[PDB]
Amino acid sequence: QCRIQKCTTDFVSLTSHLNSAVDGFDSEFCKALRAYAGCTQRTSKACRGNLVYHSAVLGISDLMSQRNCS
Amino acid sequence: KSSCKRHPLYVDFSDVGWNDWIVAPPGYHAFYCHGECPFPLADHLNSTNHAIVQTLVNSVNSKIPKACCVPTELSAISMLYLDENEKVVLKNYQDMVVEGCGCR
């Protein structure tokens, strides 16, 4: 069974920090992004034909570009 | 300006980066909703009482925004994807295409 909603809810929970920037949220948000990216990559086999999953992968790597992370 | 209407939108899965998991179709006509929601509301037969209350509140106080033009009638589509065995699988994906737009 695909556990993609688990990854998103956890990410939405962790990304409850506004704004500041110190700076800042760059080291905070990219940690949350990587955690999300890792969670989605772990449930990858189970989400083979899940639309919400395939949207999450393209959504994560889009946020990874601006601002630059990894 | 232009009121709440449905607008064309062809989603090419290759441009979007989904050609790797969707076997067929190559894309689909999803459409999108866009437009002003003044009195009387678009899709007024199905529109919520809240949208009716909010567009009335907006008419008295512009600080409160008008209702918003979103898909109110959607339809599903069948797509093909490959599983671990590299075998094609059919699945119906709900609320993929817009049939009608309304104010919410």
UniProtKB/Swiss-Prot annotation, chain A:
<feature type="glycosylation site" description="N-linked (GlcNAc...) asparagine">
    <location>
        <position position="68"/>
    </location>
</feature>
<comment type="subunit">
    <text>Homooligomer. Interacts with DRGX. Interacts with BMP2 and BMP4. Interacts with the BMP type I receptors ACVR1, BMPR1A and BMPR1B and with the BMP type II receptor ACVR2B. The functional complex with its receptor NEO1/neogenin appears to be a heterotetramer with a 2:2 stoichiometry, RGM molecules acting as staples that bring two NEO1 receptors together without interacting themselves, this arrangement leads to activation of downstream signaling via RhoA.</text>
</comment>
<protein>
    <recommendedName>
        <fullName>Repulsive guidance molecule B</fullName>
    </recommendedName>
</protein>
<comment type="function">
    <text>Member of the repulsive guidance molecule (RGM) family that contributes to the patterning of the developing nervous system. Acts as a bone morphogenetic protein (BMP) coreceptor that potentiates BMP signaling. Promotes neuronal adhesion. May inhibit neurite outgrowth.</text>
</comment>
<comment type="similarity">
    <text>Belongs to the repulsive guidance molecule (RGM) family.</text>
</comment>
Swiss-Prot record, chain B:
<feature type="glycosylation site" description="N-linked (GlcNAc...) (high mannose) asparagine">
    <location>
        <position position="46"/>
    </location>
</feature>
<feature type="disulfide bond">
    <location>
        <begin position="4"/>
        <end position="69"/>
    </location>
</feature>
<comment type="subunit">
    <text>Homodimer; disulfide-linked. Interacts with SOSTDC1. Interacts with GREM2, RGMA, RGMB and RGMC. Interacts with ASPN. Interacts with MAFP5. Interacts with FBN1 (via N-terminal domain) and FBN2. Interacts with type I receptor BMPR1A. Interacts with type II receptor BMPR2. Interacts with SCUBE3. Interacts with TNFAIP6 (primarily via Link domain); this interaction is inhibited by hyaluronan. Interacts with ERFE. Interacts with BMPR1A/ALK3; the interaction may induce HAMP expression.</text>
</comment>
<comment type="similarity">
    <text>Belongs to the TGF-beta family.</text>
</comment>
<feature type="disulfide bond">
    <location>
        <begin position="37"/>
        <end position="103"/>
    </location>
</feature>
<feature type="disulfide bond">
    <location>
        <begin position="33"/>
        <end position="101"/>
    </location>
</feature>
<protein>
    <recommendedName>
        <fullName>Bone morphogenetic protein 2</fullName>
    </recommendedName>
</protein>
<comment type="function">
    <text>Growth factor of the TGF-beta superfamily that plays essential roles in many developmental processes, including cardiogenesis, neurogenesis, and osteogenesis. Induces cartilage and bone formation. Initiates the canonical BMP signaling cascade by associating with type I receptor BMPR1A and type II receptor BMPR2. Once all three components are bound together in a complex at the cell surface, BMPR2 phosphorylates and activates BMPR1A. In turn, BMPR1A propagates signal by phosphorylating SMAD1/5/8 that travel to the nucleus and act as activators and repressors of transcription of target genes.</text>
</comment>
